[model samples]
Target: DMYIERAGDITWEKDAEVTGNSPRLDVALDESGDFSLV
Candidate 1:
């Protein structure tokens, strides 16, 4: 999937900024698919 392809760049957080630092797994996906990870 396209979304999966760019997973590396995905924030995976509710208030995360994609500074391209590291991938955080401590995330939670809401009903709408939005997440909240550090």
Candidate 2:
């Protein structure tokens, strides 16, 4: 099963509804036009 939700960063979060203190996901595009997780 696959579960997708709106998160902050590559880190984790708890009750991030009002408290949007989720880990920020640092990402970038690779040279090959691919998604890279920084």
lDDT against the true structure, per candidate, is 0.69, 0.79
Clash pairs detected, candidate 2? 9-23, 9-24, 9-25
The prediction achieving the highest lDDT against the true structure is 2
Clashes of each: 2, 3
Give the local distance difference test score of model 2. Answer: 0.79
TM-score of each candidate structure, all chains considered together: 0.32, 0.29
Q: Which candidate is the best by TM-score?
A: 1
> Which 10-residue window in model 1 sums to the lowest lDDT?
1-10
Q: After superposition, which runs of candidate 1 have C-alpha atoms over 4 Å from their true positions?
A: 1-22
RMSD value for candidate 1: 12.2
